[PDB]
Design a protein around this ligand. Structure first.
Ligand SMILES: CC(C)=CCC/C(C)=C/CC[C@H](C)CCOP(=O)(O)OP(=O)(O)O
Ligand SMILES: [Mg+2]
Ligand SMILES: [Mg+2]
Ligand SMILES: [Mg+2]
Length: 346
């Protein structure tokens, strides 16, 4: 049983003032569309997902904060319900089929397929609201990000089926998408009523800082969710387990290695973000601000949600974040998939 120390975060807390209302409405949405089994849904509605969304978009439009909250709950419906606690999570092929069908539902809610499925019904509601607050381009990017996430959990499912653990490079590539962090990004834009244009959005350096945010968010989750994940009865995967296997480390040593990794990415993220903001559009400056909100929102939620603190078997969690890193170096991570990020330092 590991003790997680306070993690470094240079980002101040913030939350949308209607967080309480949003959390209630998300629970009601889950019931209306019957998302997940009765057992899963009963857990999900207590995990403060609305509160989490409120921290991601603290000054966002209330309707989009609610959309994002509903979407996060829906994603847990897929990720818990099928991938990690369902039969399809051991069957990559069958999972691939379900997920292709769901993509089609997102693209065309009017198509007469999966008319019986609660997840499909919820997805249709989400798509119709994306249509309200998003452009055609943002809607297509949302679908593409859903496909990214889906493809990556099919890859994760192959490891669960085989009972194997990927090496660090493969895990990093998989984890950059299997946390669904990329699907949230279009809603960051919609939350503030703007569109980040392709010439900025798809610029390598801008993709890079988005990937860094994804890395920090998923590593922070790997750290804070290690307790609930390891104590489960089934297969689990996270950075600590990968580091244990690859480097022959104890869980405690793996924790320290993972903290060092996310500390260095946090430092790089702030530096490269600052560079980009100096001569970026006003829209890019807002997008970069929202990436900070997403990173910090996930941090505050990660140490407080009953999803991670698990009251029936209390996790040893920090109560605060620190303003100084443990690893301050500019040495790149020994991970080929992301070590190029450090080339962006001007
Ligand atoms: C990654 C994060 C904390 C928030 C991102 C916001 C978001 C889109 C959450 C949906 C859940 C996602 C699909 C899995 C996260 O990983 P995992 O399988 O480790 O989640 P679990 O640790 O909560 O079981
Ligand atoms: Mg997962
Ligand atoms: Mg999970
Ligand atoms: Mg986790």
């Amino acid at each position: 049983e590991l003790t997680v120390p306070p993690l470094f975060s240079p980002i101040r807390q913030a939350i949308h003032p209607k967080h309480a209302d949003i959390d209630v409405q998300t629970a009601a949405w889950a019931e209306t569309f019957r998302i997940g089994s009765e057992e899963l849904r009963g857990k999900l509605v207590t995990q403060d997902i609305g509160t989490f969304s409120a921290r991601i978009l603290p000054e966002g439009r209330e309707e989009v904060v609610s959309l994002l909250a509903d979407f996060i709950l829906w994603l847990f419906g897929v990720d818990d319900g099928h991938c990690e606690e369902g039969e399809l999570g051991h069957r990559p092929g069958d999972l691939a089929g379900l997920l292709h069908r769901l993509i089609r539902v997102a693209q065309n809610p009017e198509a007469p397929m999966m008319q019986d499925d609660p997840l499909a019904a919820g997805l249709r509601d989400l798509r119709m609201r994306v249509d309200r607050f998003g452009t055609a381009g943002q809607t297509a990017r949302w679908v593409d990000a859903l496909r990214e996430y889906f493809f990556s959990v099919v890859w994760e499912a192959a490891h669960r089926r085989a009972g194997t653990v990927p090496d660090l490079n493969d895990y990093t590539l998989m984890r950059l998408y299997d946390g669904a962090t990329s699907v949230v990004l279009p809603m960051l834009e919609m939350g503030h009523g703007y569109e980040l244009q392709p010439y900025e959005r798809d610029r390598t350096a801008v993709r890079a800082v988005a990937e860094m945010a994804s890395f920090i968010i998923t590593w922070d989750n790997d750290i804070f969710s290690y307790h609930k994940e390891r104590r489960g009865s089934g297969y689990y995967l996270n950075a600590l387990r990968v580091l244990e296997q690859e480097r022959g480390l104890t869980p405690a040593q793996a924790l320290d290695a993972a903290i060092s990794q996310r500390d260095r990415v946090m430092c790089l993220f702030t530096t490269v973000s600052e560079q980009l903001a100096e001569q970026g559009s006003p829209q890019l400056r807002q997008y970069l601000h929202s990436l900070r909100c997403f990173i910090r929102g996930a941090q505050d939620w990660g140490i407080s949600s009953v999803r991670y603190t698990t009251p029936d078997d209390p996790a040893n969690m920090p109560s605060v974040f620190t303003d100084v890193p443990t690893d301050d170096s500019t040495e790149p991570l020994d991970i080929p998939a992301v070590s190029w990020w450090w080339d962006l330092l001007a």
